[PDB]
Design a protein around this ligand. Structure first.
Ligand SMILES: Nc1ncnc2c1ncn2[C@@H]1O[C@H](COP(=O)(O)OP(=O)(O)O)[C@@H](O)[C@H]1O
Ligand SMILES: [Mg+2]
Length: 324
């Protein structure tokens, strides 16, 4: 694809770039939508994959889409997408976390609900981002916040869960992949019956849990959900749910992802009710899509190679419609 690479180089040599750094200020969003470009791996560089993604600013991602005219003239359809944050291949997990999940950790101490989702094709970087990862960094900061004088008063304990969702069925990853069941009552309250919450006193305990759990969980065909639950005297104070979604590149997965978008869209419009029932994922998280102090972030992970271009565009089109 020598000519497409040449055109991409000419575009990049003229593009003056000012991407995100950590001295950009943390932003407080109800709905935060971001994109994360991973680097080409050694195998992609070996197969001579072209990088078709540029990030000229904090908010802007460009796709250099290779196109053919009817007369077989090669050109680039350079497509732009605008997000709350765009993270390039130099952004570490710590930098991503700062602008996404980290500002939502306080939310659960104010008695709110927080969610964080990684979304994109298999091989994009969802598990790398969540599972070092955002689960561990959130857990760390939860234990720093609850040792502070303000919140050390409240008598808070920290509990955790870790489950996967495959083909509309929930499996407990901390209790031997037991097939739990999700039930809803007349007041639209949802409970995952048989899901045990595990008490934890340190972030090191949680990392042992995530490692225990990850060993259990193709994991590209399932959702994995790790929850941090704050309880005040056994009474729930706050909850953070963090989800490594199934790869979006079949019919169960697609309806699940579509369901999630609609629930996030409803949260965005501060609606009293959302269409939570349309997948198991959204049913289990129903509580996180409603309320005054409910907040969410989604990280759309992308593979930058020319051969993934159509999957990249699908991911970006979806992420584009998550926040209005
Ligand atoms: N930002 C990144 N920097 C370096 N390597 C990455 C990055 N994102 C993903 N990878 C690596 O690429 C491979 C695929 O990532 P993974 O997290 O398993 O993808 P997914 O969960 O979306 O299928 C892994 O070996 C992973 O560690
Ligand atoms: Mg994965």
């Amino acid at each position: 694809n020598w000519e497409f690479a040449r055109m991409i180089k000419e575009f990049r040599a003229t593009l003056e770039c000012h991407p995100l750094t950590m001295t950009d200020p943390i932003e407080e969003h109800r709905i935060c939508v971001c994109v994360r470009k991973r680097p080409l791996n050694k195998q992609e560089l070996a197969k001579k994959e072209i990088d078709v993604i540029s990030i000229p600013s904090k908010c802007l991602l460009l796709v250099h889409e290779p196109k053919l005219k009817v007369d077989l003239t090669k050109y680039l359809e350079n497509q732009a997408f605008c997000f709350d944050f765009a993270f390039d291949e130099t952004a570490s997990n710590e930098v991503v976390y700062r602008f996404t999940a980290r500002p939502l950790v306080q939310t659960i101490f104010e008695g709110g609900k927080a969610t964080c989702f990684a979304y994109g094709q298999t091989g994009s970087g969802k598990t790398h981002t969540m599972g070092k990862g955002i689960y561990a960094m959130a857990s760390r900061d939860v234990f720093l916040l609850k040792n502070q004088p303000c919140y050390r008063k409240l008598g808070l304990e920290v509990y955790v869960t870790f489950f996967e969702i495959y083909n509309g069925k929930l499996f407990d990853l901390l209790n031997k992949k037991a097939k739990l069941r999700v039930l809803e009552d007349g007041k639209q309250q949802v409970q995952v019956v048989g899901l045990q919450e595990h008490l934890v006193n340190s972030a090191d305990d949680v990392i042992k849990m995530i490692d225990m759990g990850s060993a259990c969980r193709n994991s590209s065909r399932s959702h994995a959900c790790f929850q941090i639950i704050l309880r005040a005297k056994g009474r729930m104070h706050g909850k953070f749910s963090l989800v490594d979604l199934a790869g979006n590149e079949g019919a169960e997965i697609n309806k699940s992802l579509l369901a999630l978008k609609e629930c996030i869209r409803a949260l965005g419009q501060n609606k009293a009710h959302t269409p939570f029932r349309e997948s198991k994922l959204t049913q289990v998280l129903r509580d996180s899509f409603i309320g005054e102090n409910s907040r969410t972030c989604m990280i759309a992970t992308i593979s930058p190679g020319i051969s993934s271009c159509e999957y990249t565009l699908n991911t970006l089109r979806y992420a584009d419609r998550v926040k209005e």
